[PDB]
Amino acid sequence: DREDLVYQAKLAEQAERYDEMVESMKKVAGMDVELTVEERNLLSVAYKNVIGARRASWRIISSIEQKEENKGGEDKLKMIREYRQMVETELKLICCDILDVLDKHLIPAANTGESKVFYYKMKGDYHRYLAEFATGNDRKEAAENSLVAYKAASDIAMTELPPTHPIRLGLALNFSVFYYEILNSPDRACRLAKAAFDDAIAELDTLSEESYKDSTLIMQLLRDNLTLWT
Amino acid sequence: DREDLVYQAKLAEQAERYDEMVESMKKVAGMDVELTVEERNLLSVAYKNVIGARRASWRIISSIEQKEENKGGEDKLKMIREYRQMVETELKLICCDILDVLDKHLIPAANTGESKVFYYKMKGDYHRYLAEFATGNDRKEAAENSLVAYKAASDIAMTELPPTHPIRLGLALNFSVFYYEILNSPDRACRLAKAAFDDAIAELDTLSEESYKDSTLIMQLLRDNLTLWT
Amino acid sequence: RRRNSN
Amino acid sequence: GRRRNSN
């Protein structure tokens, strides 16, 4: 199976039929074993695209709702908010699907610095995506449940992974995003962004040509945010 | 009812959720009515996108299959041909779904020069998408129905639409694509495409602004195809 | 480039 | 404004 199932998940990625890519890699996750860097990323990508679609929809749907609050038309607004919530269910369903795989199947089964830090970061992201659309004491619940799960990968990263390791750098990229977006803290976002970038500069000397490539790209993203946010 | 369905189909278009957009517009098309040009376009786009995605998948899966036949790695190609055939089924079902809708509702209840041409065009396009992935007596059967539908739309277009009319150029664009891609006939493709371009140019002197935008848009698409093809 | 169809 | 980066 598992030798095949990963190829089934590769085909879905190419076909861009991510709903299958998920199902394939959930069947690999549900083996309760050490996922290879590949399997880790294939799973990672599958859910990112699936949620991605709904997230994109949501922002757009809210763009019409806000464009019809300014326009004042409060008859369409009834159907539109009916439509945004329909998505918000899927955003709830998808997020809660993957988180459920992480704390039950993946996180327990993890036994390497990378995969340990990989999954806690992941847990942060989907709690964040929950927090992205939510309101009131629903936001604060998943906001604090992310800030914990990010801070958990942060701590395990700072001993097991070097500062130039992309998984750690992507964490800081997403964590910085968490402050600027979720907690509305533009300062701590940048400080954490620049911080993550600045610690990386030193150790690039030592790493591989392909490992230098992986690091530099995520440093560009970190820098691209700091650029945009100032 | 139709008012609600059509605004739900616009929201779907914007969220790029074309599986729901198809639902909305099929419910409209069930009412056995002459569709407004908006309903016609919304219907076309919604189905165009849903088939669109499958066709892009099929192309990409067929590529991986042909790039694994040549390399000669045969054991992995067992999964791919089931995964292609799956997509082929989804295609066959979408094409069949719209054709059933065209045959049973739209064409029967279409007493208007434009709609008639539009629907016979649509019928040809979907027979063409059937012809795309088909082989043997299948490909011949679909190609015959595709052609018959384009000649049946062309006949009606040449009598009841001026050459400027975008729906007639559209038909002329997709018919040229049929010749090029399905009959493997680049000359008749170029000759048919240009012939439509070179009729509209003349009577073009005399159009409302927003029509010139339409006519010109489709003429760019004709000129590009000729450009690409030569 | 992919030939246009409408 | 072009969109922020997340990985």
Numbering used by the authors:
A (entry chain B), B (entry chain A): 3 to 232
C (entry chain C): 7 to 12
D (entry chain D): 6 to 12
Q: From the publication, what sentences describe this entry?
A:
Homodimers of 14-3-3 proteins, or heterodimers with other 14-3-3 isoforms (Chaudhri et al., 2003), bind a wide range of cellular substrates and often sequester them in the cytoplasm (Mackintosh, 2004; Pozuelo Rubio et al., 2004; Tinti et al., 2014). Most 14-3-3 substrates are phosphorylated proteins in which a consensus phosphopeptide motif is recognized by a structurally characterized binding pocket formed by 14-3-3 multimers (Mackintosh, 2004; Yang et al., 2006). We interrogated an intracellular signaling pathway frequently hyperactivated in human cancers and mediated by the enzymes phosphatidylinositol 3-kinase (PI3K) and protein kinase B (AKT) (Fresno Vara et al., 2004; Vivanco and Sawyers, 2002). Its constitutive activation inactivates the tumor-suppressive transcription factor, FOXO3a (Brunet et al., 1999; Burgering and Kops, 2002), by inducing its phosphorylation and cytosolic sequestration by factors such as the 14-3-3 protein family (Brunet et al., 2002; Mackintosh, 2004; Van Der Heide et al., 2004). A hit peptide engages the 14-3-3 family of signal regulators through a phosphorylation-dependent interaction, modulates FOXO3a-mediated transcription, and suppresses cancer cell growth.
In a crystal structure, the hit peptide occupies the phosphopeptide-binding groove of 14-3-3ε in a conformation distinct from its natural peptide substrates. X-ray crystallography reveals a non-canonical structural interaction between the peptide and 14-3-3ε. Interestingly, comparison with other available crystal structures of phosphopeptide-bound 14-3-3ε revealed several structural differences. Residues 9J10Arg7, 9J10Arg9, 9J10Asn10, 9J10pSer11, and 9J10Asn12 all make favorable interactions with 14-3-3ε. Of note are the intramolecular interactions between the phosphate moiety and the NH-guanidino group of 9J10Arg9 at the −2 position relative to pSer (i.e., pS(−2)), and the salt bridge between 9J10Arg7 at pS(−4) and 14-3-3εAsp226. In addition, 9J10Arg8 at pS(−3) undergoes significant conformational change compared with the Arg at pS(−3) in the other canonical peptides. Indeed, FLAG-14-3-3 co-immunoprecipitates with 9J10WT but not 9J10AMut. Significantly, there is a sharp reduction in the interaction between FLAG-14-3-3 and FOXO3a in cells expressing 9J10WT, whereas 9J10AMut fails to perturb this interaction.
